[PDB]
Design a protein around this ligand. Structure first.
Ligand SMILES: COc1cc(-c2cncc(-c3ccc(C4CCN(C)CC4)cc3)c2C)cc(OC)c1OC
Ligand SMILES: COc1cc(-c2cncc(-c3ccc(C4CCN(C)CC4)cc3)c2C)cc(OC)c1OC
Ligand SMILES: COc1cc(-c2cncc(-c3ccc(C4CCN(C)CC4)cc3)c2C)cc(OC)c1OC
Length: 287
């Protein structure tokens, strides 16, 4: 019987953080991405592994799973997650340098909405539990060669049948600790808030009438870098600020429709926010 080639050549590091590292790797000529977890973030490996052991997600707008590997070392355990490799990198990276036209902007945001609705929706029978992401942001979205994106990092995901989200993207009910933690719909509504911020980040980079905004992260003008939980709560909960919509958007029918969409992701009342399925429908009718 058979040879099980497990050797993965780590070729270059494309990411280093408190999470650990991501490497471009090669298995059998074929490019893979290898996330090597820090000790700090072991529970993210376990959670993503537990989810994929429960349901083998397969969707064009979800980063493709290849393998979870645990290897015993002299005095530690090494944890690797192996996925598809997207050489264009994260949406965060991509937006820094690249501007968008109407077609690319819509393709990006509809692909993200598609991936998010896929996570959110329970399918009965080759089915899946409903899933909420809990850390949606432009660094957790990859740009594919075909212009569509895919959602990455299910390390905080929750399923329905001490890692917390990135503070800059936390919904008001997370910051004021009123979120109903027993309620699955609560977690979907937290993802819709974060989606609305991502839609703002992308829409800024769409050119209209020769104008584009510089890349900025959500709330760049009202909080410091690495904003505290308190910094965010005062802006989002107490003062009820929302990202600025520039005047130039209201000359462009695509950006006018997207400003309305992002407004309906940012209601203080979580139950007033649009669903991912309703966002998809709205986006298919733009242009
Ligand atoms: C263990 O570890 C790793 C394994 C592999 C890997 C390498 N060659 C072949 C395989 C393979 C897949 C599937 C079957 C089927 C065929 C027969 N059918 C009736 C049931 C079983 C057999 C063999 C795998 C899974 C790659 C890895 O990394 C890319 C591994 O490390 C994470
Ligand atoms: C993990 O990832 C990759 C794995 C492989 C790979 C290697 N050996 C064998 C296999 C295999 C063969 C046959 C079955 C069976 C299942 C039962 N049914 C009755 C018929 C089909 C399953 C598995 C695969 C899938 C290739 C890959 O890329 C080319 C992988 O991606 C990097
Ligand atoms: C968010 O999360 C995960 C992401 C990935 C992932 C998948 N494809 C590609 C990448 C990537 C490749 C290349 C660049 C740069 C380097 C070269 N040049 C300067 C431009 C582009 C950036 C990023 C990553 C980081 C894998 C993961 O796990 C294995 C992730 O975690 C789940």
């Amino acid at each position: 019987q058979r040879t099980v080639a497990r050797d993965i050549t780590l070729l270059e590091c494309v990411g280093k953080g408190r999470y650990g590292e991501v490497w471009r790797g090669s298995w059998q000529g074929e490019n893979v991405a290898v996330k090597i977890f820090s000790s700090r973030d072991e529970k993210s490996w376990f959670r993503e592994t537990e989810l994929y052991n429960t349901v083998m997600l397969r969707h064009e707008n979800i980063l493709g799973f290849i393998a979870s590997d645990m290897t015993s070392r002299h005095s530690s355990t090494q944890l690797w997650l192996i996925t598809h490799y997207h050489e264009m990198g994260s949406l965060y990276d991509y937006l820094q340098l690249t501007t968008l036209d109407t077609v690319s902007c819509l393709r990006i945001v509809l692909s993200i909405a598609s991936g998010l609705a896929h996570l959110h929706i329970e399918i009965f029978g080759q089915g899946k539990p409903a899933i909420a992401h809990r850390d949606l942001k432009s660094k957790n979205i990859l740009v594919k060669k075909n212009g569509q994106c895919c959602i990455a990092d299910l390390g905080l995901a929750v399923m329905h049948s001490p890692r917390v989200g990135t503070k800059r993207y936390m919904a008001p009910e997370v910051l004021d600790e009123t979120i109903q933690v027993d309620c699955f719909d609560s977690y979907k509504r937290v993802d819709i808030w974060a989606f609305g911020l991502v839609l703002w980040e992308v829409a800024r980079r769409m050119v209209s009438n020769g104008i584009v905004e510089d890349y900025k992260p959500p709330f760049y003008d009202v909080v410091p870098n690495d904003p505290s939980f308190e910094d965010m709560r005062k802006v989002v909960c107490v003062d009820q600020q929302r990202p600025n919509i520039p005047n130039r958007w209201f000359s462009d029918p695509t950006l006018t429709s997207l400003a309305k969409l992002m407004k309906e992701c940012w209601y203080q009342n979580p139950s007033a926010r649009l669903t991912a399925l309703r966002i998809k429908k709205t986006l298919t009718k733009i242009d």
